[PDB]
């Protein structure tokens, strides 16, 4: 039996793997500490906001900014700064964008407070739908008596684009609801739907579908010239009369063309501009933006 004691050696075998295993564990814990040092940062966000600031996108463009994208602005009378999308050109013109339609992802049937404050999303590439907010449009367009211009840009389901300019554009205070006012239609291939249109269903159509001097309305705050509620019937937020001839915050129809049956009450409620297409053609893309009038927009210097 003083042989079976061959175990002396076998036992020393086991002791060796036991000891290398322990060190291999210590080594592995070192390697785990080195993976940890690589897993500390957050995912990288592609969206970024520029640091230059000013009273509006034109003030930003005069301070040197060259790129289109996200910036903070702060008009004189404004209490807090707010984010906007600035459209900058090679000619140094800085446009502040307040409305964008491009794919139907956002729902534009919002209430009085959502039209006041703003809804939708901002993007550095300008590839998102939004409404900037009536309070903001009011603050930028009425800073110390500086004539402002509005430019509307349309696009149809064939790549074809048209524009429409308005001089001395202003949005009024919340106490005047946010009345839209402009002096004159300043040109453009899309024509002047703000002047109203004669749809022919009646001799009074042109007068009841003009937009100058109309208060803003939403389904829960009616200030239209109609006995019913234009905003609740057409499903949007807009400067309604009885009810409209231009309607960019309307319903997004895929394909352009749509008909009375597609509508929920039998009225045209799509993204329309009556001097460019029928009331039964809804646009593919839209943009509303503003700039001090002395600049471009059929402008001086």
């Amino acid at each position: 039996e003083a042989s079976i004691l061959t175990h002396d050696s076998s036992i020393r075998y086991l002791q060796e793997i036991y000891n290398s295993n322990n060190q291999k564990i210590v080594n592995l814990k070192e390697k785990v500490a080195q993976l940890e040092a690589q897993c500390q940062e957050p995912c990288k966000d592609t969206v970024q906001i520029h640091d230059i600031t000013g009273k509006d996108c034109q003030d930003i463009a005069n301070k040197g900014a060259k790129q289109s994208g996200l910036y903070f602005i702060k008009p004189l009378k404004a209490n807090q700064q707010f984010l906007v999308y600035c459209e900058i050109d090679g000619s140094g013109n800085g446009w502040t964008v307040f409305q964008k339609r491009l794919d139907g992802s956002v729902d534009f049937k919002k209430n009085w407070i959502q039209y006041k404050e703003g809804f939708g999303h901002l993007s550095p590439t300008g590839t998102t739908e939004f409404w900037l907010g009536n309070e903001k449009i009011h603050l930028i367009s009425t800073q110390s008596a500086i004539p402002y211009a509005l430019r509307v840009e349309l696009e149809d389901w064939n790549g074809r684009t048209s524009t429409a300019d308005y001089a001395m554009f202003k949005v009024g205070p919340e106490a005047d609801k946010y009345r839209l006012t402009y002096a004159y239609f300043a040109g453009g291939d899309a024509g002047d739907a703000f002047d109203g249109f004669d749809f022919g269903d009646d001799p009074s159509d042109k007068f009841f579908t003009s937009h100058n001097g109309m208060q803003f309305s939403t389904w829960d705050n009616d200030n239209d010239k109609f006995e019913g509620n234009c905003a609740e019937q057409d499903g949007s937020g807009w400067w309604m009369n009885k009810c409209h001839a231009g309607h960019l915050n309307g319903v997004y129809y895929q394909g352009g063309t749509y008909s009375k049956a597609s509508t929920p009450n039998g009225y045209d409620n799509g993204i329309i501009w009556a001097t460019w297409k029928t009331r039964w053609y809804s646009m593919k893309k839209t943009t509303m933006k503003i700039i001090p009038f002395n600049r471009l927009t059929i402008g001086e210097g």
Binding site: T209, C230, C243, R279
Partner: peptide, 4 residues
């Protein structure tokens, strides 16, 4: 959008 007239309201006939």
């Amino acid at each position: 959008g007239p309201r006939p």
